[PDB]
Design a protein around this ligand. Structure first.
Ligand SMILES: COC[C@H]1CC[C@@H]2/C1=C\[C@]1(C)C(=C([C@H](C)COC(C)=O)C[C@@H]1O)[C@@H](O)[C@H](O)[C@@H]2C
Ligand SMILES: COC[C@H]1CC[C@@H]2/C1=C\[C@]1(C)C(=C([C@H](C)COC(C)=O)C[C@@H]1O)[C@@H](O)[C@H](O)[C@@H]2C
Ligand SMILES: [Cl-]
Ligand SMILES: [Cl-]
Ligand SMILES: [Mg+2]
Ligand SMILES: [Mg+2]
Ligand SMILES: [Mg+2]
Ligand SMILES: [Mg+2]
Ligand SMILES: [Mg+2]
Ligand SMILES: [Mg+2]
Ligand SMILES: [Mg+2]
Ligand SMILES: [Mg+2]
Lengths: 5, 236, 236, 5
């Protein structure tokens, strides 16, 4: 899954 | 109320204990209470606020995706009709998720953003505003979807403009904001080219600024730069 | 209410969806609603009931232990006085945990146990009764501690007596009950010798019965036998 | 940690 923060 | 009778410092102390105990709903409720005291938040307190809600809403989003996937499979050809329960329970989770996003957006609007004058606080709160409209956009399917997407975009863009003017390219908040705005472009605004260009430029501008940093700041920035790289690797 | 207006079958279907979504509080609330319909539970439904609450209460117990440990460190020599917050928040979590245990014990008493005639249901519900008094015993520090421990003991013992008379030594419910009763002896009743003897005898009596089983039943029983072995290895 | 089930 793509990263977010 | 119900945090109205507790001391601001006690709310903060309890928020830290709830974090240690992985009790994120309590942590969020304590931080909501602390914001509602009306005083501005310190750096460390803004972090606690953001961590509490990011965890609460991350659990609801992961659950919504599980249920959405099930509901989609139930709508495929030759799936047996199982009644309204899947849709009802996805809507229940979706409604609760929306309520959490509305609560955070409420805190930002009343009155975190308007009293936030320093770049580090203003950009932090505007990124949260972008993030919570983005989560509303993930579930939105009706008349308001375009306006919700544009609210995410406008908040991220105002934070981008301030961060570019006022913060170094390696600032963790600048890098985190760009990471999330790039995700918004990719999967909400149907602009994967913009998402890629943003993640690339952000990574390279931070690379070139690493030499100005202490060892500890270097560690902080390179951590988020790796998330930019993970997305570029996934998307290209 | 609030599950009073939902169909029993819809509550069960939603409990399964909440399990897939790891939404254990919802799963428990749906199963409570299903029990409150007043009909007996099937094997699969008793499993859902037990899984929902075991997860809810397991999260509260892990959080209570984190906070208890912190509170203990705050009470050591030369620890700085930090006020009542640690104790307050441990008490908040402890109270909520007690409420969950009381809710399960309420369901068992009104009216699961009294209508449960088959060994597999009677022993299952009595094990749950032992388990939830045991969790109350974990946090109990006052006048009632001895009575709460004896209620855990009496329920486990009635389940042991029925299981020994009515179920094979390899039955997963028999093995799970013995595993938990052995843990009760070790860490609640201060009887580690009894805990060890019980885990040993249970393991060996099941070993000798494995040859009667299908491949699938063999897998089911040996899974719980390994938990008995893990505890024996830890304790000896 | 000891096992229960
Ligand atoms: C509103 O968006 C907040 C979000 C923007 C980037 C990042 C954010 C959140 C938190 C608080 C941090 C990290 C770091 C990546 C990991 O933690 C460490 C050791 O720095 C993950 C945490 O959720 C802070 O620390 C960062 O300084 C910075 C504020
Ligand atoms: C009231 O105590 C219930 C507790 C006693 C032993 C065990 C229990 C719970 C659950 C439902 C099971 C497992 C197995 C160990 C793993 O799951 C599998 C694949 O069987 C773990 C689950 O919590 C059932 O399956 C077992 O048949 C059996 C009822
Ligand atoms: Cl529902
Ligand atoms: Cl509290
Ligand atoms: Mg005060
Ligand atoms: Mg069919
Ligand atoms: Mg909806
Ligand atoms: Mg100000
Ligand atoms: Mg009906
Ligand atoms: Mg001192
Ligand atoms: Mg108490
Ligand atoms: Mg009956």
């Amino acid at each position: 899954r793509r990263k977010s923060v | 109320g119900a945090m109205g009778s507790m001391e601001r410092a006690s709310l903060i102390q309890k928020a830290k204990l709830a974090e240690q105990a992985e009790r994120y709903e309590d942590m969020a409720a304590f931080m909501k209470g602390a914001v509602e005291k009306g005083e501005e938040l310190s750096n460390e307190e803004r972090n606690l606020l953001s961590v509490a809600y990011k965890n609460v809403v991350g659990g609801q989003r992961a659950a919504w995706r599980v249920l959405s996937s099930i509901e989609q499979k139930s709508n495929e050809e030759g799936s047996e009709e199982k009644g309204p329960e899947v849709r009802e329970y996805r809507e229940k989770v979706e409604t609760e998720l929306q309520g959490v996003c509305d609560t955070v957006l409420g805190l930002l609007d009343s009155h975190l953003i308007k009293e936030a004058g320093d770049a580090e606080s203003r950009v932090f709160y505007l990124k949260m505003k972008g993030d919570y409209y983005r989560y509303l956009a993930e579930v939105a399917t009706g008349d308001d979807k375009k306006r919700i997407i544009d609210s995410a975009r406008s908040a991220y863009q105002e934070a981008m403009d301030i961060s570019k003017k006022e913060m170094p390219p390696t600032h963790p908040i600048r890098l985190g904001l760009a990471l999330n705005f790039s995700v918004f472009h990719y999967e909400i605004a149907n602009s994967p080219e913009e998402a890629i260009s943003l993640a690339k430029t952000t990574f390279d501008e931070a690379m070139a600024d690493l030499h100005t940093l202490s060892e500890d700041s270097y560690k902080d920035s390179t951590l988020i730069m790796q998330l930019l790289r993970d997305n570029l690797t996934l998307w290209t």
